[PDB]
Ligand binder design. Structure first.
Ligand code: NA
Ligand code: NA
Ligand code: NA
Ligand code: NA
Ligand code: NA
Ligand code: NA
Ligand code: NA
Ligand code: NA
Ligand code: NA
Lengths: 516, 516, 516
């Protein structure tokens, strides 16, 4: 309504009400006027010897709002609270509000560089509710709301990648260009604000519990089966079998089978033992798409890295986050120390080991002359009677991802973990309306010189989650996430002398135990 | 109400009413007071050279009611009746009742060992309706209701297996212990009884019919296709094709594809021909889970063993039951004779042969210098346009199995055949309340000496099944299960001189024929 | 109603409903017919060189029901659940039921010793609702309901201690004798049962949280005080002062003062360092009552043992429980290992160190000739502006205790921790009605020979607790009780191979953090 009046109050809070909890988090932000208010055609030929890095696309002046990161909404304890006493959760509804828009104009004379605000200028927000733009938000890229309410953050620029021709930079006749100014968008001078309201589609509860039974040894030990297994051949080519018995769990008919597997090699950590001076890329797991070899991280789930105990990890199949945020374009080498590496060990009983072969099966036809032989297999895909656990979500991990448009998706859980959404939280685009510099002469060609200015405002995301009440009959105490350190010299998830937020370790959600 | 009065009448019966039939079967049972009313920690290190047999779990004083075995509810003829004129069936509802509880106390002096009944003592029944305990019943273990109403049977002890550490006996911090006395349970002295009422979740009709068409040669022979296939290359590297024609069924575009396959080797039976003195285990098919190789029986369905005709069987992929019940802990070798072995030949046209390679595909890129080459594959998993038949259920086979708790199950049919249930018939636990011996001095430590006593009562299971009315236009008579023997010297499915129930052969359900 | 019918169903369960949770636990029990149905005058002269052990009292045939022990109602996890996410709790209501009474009669011929049940005999239960009997239950004695539902336990005999004359065994004219048969009590043959209903008086929530601020350094560091302190004297006897400043927390006016203290000496544990071959008794803390020195355990709270970190413990001031139950009358020496020792370190910031002096104050009057002097004090009692935390309750610790009858109690929290109740859960007395042997001749003297018989039945205690919802604004994750072990070789709070319940460690309730 007026320049003087606050566009909105500041809400940050967690409200636990029965079976559902709602998280409101508000933060402050800056929007540079990227690209000086013009689109740039952007492309890249193969780099580091890989045509897989070749792409053709565009860069826009628009910045976008990303909150698809659990820790944007959850405080550490709140996370803890959720992960220690709940069997699952899914996000039901979401509402966003952008306010307190303040736009500033900077002018530099002889390197003076002063910042003063014009009140006249506007900002533009619109939400792509019909998913007509490329959806960038699903793919684990920087720029989400901080995990720490205080810290101010700068909005990521919006750019998308269309299809390359022939793993060269060049475009193809099918490649398309999207203009963001084609959608109608609200324009906000300082008095005004934006409110976004949303309702999540129905998705299965993320299963935040670990199996207390091993899949194969489901059957009670006490009683033998009524089925028998082939065991040997008498001296004449005659078949003989024995009863499956009691405890033995190797030779017992099974009803259900582990998850889809594809070996990705295991590397030791800590004490370790790894091969020396090794170039990782040649031996990484990959999928060939459009005649180029692409690395696939988080090899599609149905597998596990680490067994608890031993340090070996399926690095190809694993989620790794920096301890602290770092910078754009960094090429610096990182040792194990800095990294927050994650173990899928909790999901190990249901899931298969990623650095072991998946099993073996007979490779020959037996005969009088010739004995039976078997062959191990490094990759078993999906089968009926399958059963597995999808990868755990982390306080630091992403929340959801958009399902690609195609005729079919096999049942889909983002390989990076989270909620597979057909219709996910809409792209939220915002840009600073351009203000022309001093233009004194008319031309047909478009204006090229602009006043340089950026915007800053606050934004609040309010989310509603539904919970699966914990209900177990387990007698003894379950393991839970404890803030347990010995001889600490600083708090975890807390500012330091310098003032920066410190996060020591990643946090899964699997602590509670459910028998199969 | 009173010691003298019967807690319940005896119901055994089959009622066929239109499209649905209800089976009531009642039997008699004994419940030993296992473990002298205490839990035992039970574990096993690797045996027979396999860490797969390593497990950590517990044994309870509770016995359980298992009826998950088709022949508990169906008399032979009734089975027959169902299998010869129906295209499918699923269980809609179930109701159970336990009554006529009689508890007896045995005392032995100088080896006298007398049995007299105390009327004062109780028994405990409760049903785990919320699936909070490990579900043992799904996994084809002994102790179900007899197939023969007269025979008295002893209730299986309840024990479950939690997760092992490192394929050693030892437990893990995630391993959980369940106390059965934590659930509230009805206590029954002799006058009282138990009634259980249940409603099955909706499941697809088990398809009890065999295809009368071969999958690939679906198209009518009379007419050629309007598509053509590449056939050869002219002397210059030039492509040439011919019309697909008429009857030929090898080279004709196909819309649908066979089921998932994984070779498990074939062994001859009867006349046979098998390799001599062979140790089966090295060459068995297996899956690696938690860093141990486990054998998987009934290799997940989508495959067949036997083609009719020839005796070769996919033993790894097959269902084998003893002819007669046998004993706990038996290690005796069994020849073919005793076994009731099953052929999935009826499902052969839709399904793939288990001891053959699944097919072949090109393994090289053709060039002027270099000719095209192909490679057979021993394991093909799931694909779009797939189609297969799940394994047939047997009078002797199990009915249902519980789906494991995880984020996803690919469409699941118990590998052992039956109905995949998310929420299956609840574990039914019963135990004898302990009666202290003579205790004359107080101690803080728990009482250790008990009166020795066991319980016996009857129980009835009443089930309602829905049927898919047979409706075919097949002119000529279909094959049906006939009780056909030549020169019989005893009846089948009938007592003998000794008094024991004799079952000669297994009985599938596929007899009726449905064109695709 | 009838011998045959169950007097009551078995309820064991924990129901969490919003702000209040209700715990139902049911167990089995035995009641020996103590004393052959007669009272015994019992007394003791000084033993182990202490007249403090001298007492005069009586022993009854009655056994009593004790559940005043947290772990009787809480399963491990349930405890956990409560202690990790709640700021407090108090018991609002309680209801008890005794049923399934079974009375047995034992006869021995030539050492045969058979147990058969007579159905005719009765049992007697009554509750002393008017607190007219000596209340024994408050004082941490054996015989409470087991922590493990399965285990059967024997009811403690009821005996009370009246006043001794002169620290000799002999009675005094003021000493009184209570006859339990004077109260009217329900008599129960096997068909019948007992129901007890109760409502707790209003008591402050047990504060289950640890202070995140140190009492003395409450004031913010950033700002100095506006008060100044005397610091020195100029060379002439002149007073000079400095401003209290900033961070310094030693010399800053304080509003609130630590808790009441009385030094009890500190002993090292683990690595330790303690004096060798030491007789503990001479140097133990004590209070003189009726001209005898009595040891006081749990020296009245307002103090702490242990500071976290260092192993030294105020053993006199500490709660120690055996790892496993042990036996009546044991004199066996116990090393540290067996013991579950407790640290009040969480309450350390508010509370005072027990093995340090409490402080110091000036002991002289300063003059020109003579400098000021100070003296440490080993015991400071209560003062206005006091503030402290009462000792934490343990899964293994007792729940409540009865306040003694006198004109005044200073604000009272059982020194053993728990709820100080003016009117606590009534003594629940039960005894087996005596059955005369064969008496063939009349006498005036009371019958002396009885049939020997004992009773066994189940009992259920149902409690309702109110909770203080956790509500904190602490950003970083709080510490919580985790079931965290490394290289476990058995589960904790779970049966072992032998069948006995294993409890490794004690569990406080202070995990959550509240700033002052
Ligand atoms: Na730029
Ligand atoms: Na929607
Ligand atoms: Na670095
Ligand atoms: Na046994
Ligand atoms: Na149901
Ligand atoms: Na044999
Ligand atoms: Na006695
Ligand atoms: Na009262
Ligand atoms: Na000892």
């Amino acid at each position: 309504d007026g320049v003087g009046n606050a566009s909105g109050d500041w809400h940050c809070d967690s409200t636990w009400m029965g079976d559902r909890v709602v998280t409101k988090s508000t933060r402050t932000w800056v929007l540079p006027s990227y690209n000086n208010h013009q689109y740039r055609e952007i492309k890249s030929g193969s780099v580091d010897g890989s045509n897989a890095n070749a792409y053709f696309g565009y860069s826009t002046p628009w910045g976008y709002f990303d909150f698809n990161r659990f820790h944007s909404h959850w405080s550490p304890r709140d996370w803890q609270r959720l992960i220690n006493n709940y069997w699952g959760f899914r996000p039901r509804s979401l509402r966003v509000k952008i306010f307190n828009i303040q736009v500033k104009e900077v002018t530099v004379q002889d390197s003076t560089t002063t910042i003063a605000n014009n009140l006249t200028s506007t900002v533009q927000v619109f939400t792509d509710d019909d998913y007509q733009l490329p959806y960038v938000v699903g793919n684990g890229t920087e720029g989400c709301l901080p995990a720490f309410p205080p810290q101010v953050f700068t909005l990521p620029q919006y750019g998308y990648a269309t299809l390359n021709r022939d793993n060269t930079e060049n475009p193809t006749e099918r490649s398309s260009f999207f203009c963001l100014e084609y959608f109608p968008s609200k324009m906000l001078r300082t008095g005004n604000n934006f409110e976004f309201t949303y309702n999540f589609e129905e998705v299965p509860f993320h299963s935040s519990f670990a199996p207390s039974q091993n899949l194969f040894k489901l059957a009670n030990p006490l009683v033998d089966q009524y089925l028998y297994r082939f065991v040997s051949t008498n001296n004449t080519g005659g078949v003989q079998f024995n009863k499956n018995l009691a405890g033995r769990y190797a030779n017992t008919y099974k009803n259900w089978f582990p998850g889809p597997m594809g070996r990705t090699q295991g590397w030791n950590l800590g004490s370790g033992v790894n091969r020396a001076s090794v170039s990782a890329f040649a031996t990484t797991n990959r999928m060939e798409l459009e005649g180029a070899s692409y690395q696939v991280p988080p090899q599609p789930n149905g597998m596990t890295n680490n067994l608890q105990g031993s340090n070996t990890y399926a690095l190809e199949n694993t989620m790794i986050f920096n301890s602290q945020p770092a910078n754009p374009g960094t090429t610096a080498t990182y040792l194990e120390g800095n990294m927050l590496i994650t173990s899928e060990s909790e999901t190990q009983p249901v899931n298969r080991v990623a650095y072991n072969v998946g099993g073996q099966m007979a490779t020959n036809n037996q005969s009088s002359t010739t004995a039976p032989a078997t062959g191990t297999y490094n990759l078993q895909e999906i089968v009926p009677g399958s059963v597995w656990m999808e990868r755990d979500v982390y306080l630091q991990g992403p929340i959801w991802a958009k399902i690609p448009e195609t005729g079919a998706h096999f049942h889909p859980s983002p390989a990076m973990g989270g909620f597979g959404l057909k219709h996910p939280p809409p792209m939220m685009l915002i840009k600073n309306t351009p203000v022309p510099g001093n233009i004194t002469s008319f031309s047909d060609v478009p204006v090229s010189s602009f006043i340089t200015q950026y915007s800053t405002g606050q934004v609040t995301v309010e989310m509603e989650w539904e919970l699966k009440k914990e209900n177990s009959k387990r007698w003894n105490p379950e393991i839970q996430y404890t803030n347990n350190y010995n001889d600490p010299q600083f708090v975890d998830f807390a500012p330091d002398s310098t003032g920066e937020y410190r996060t020591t370790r990643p946090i899964g959600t699997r602590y509670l135990t459910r028998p199969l």
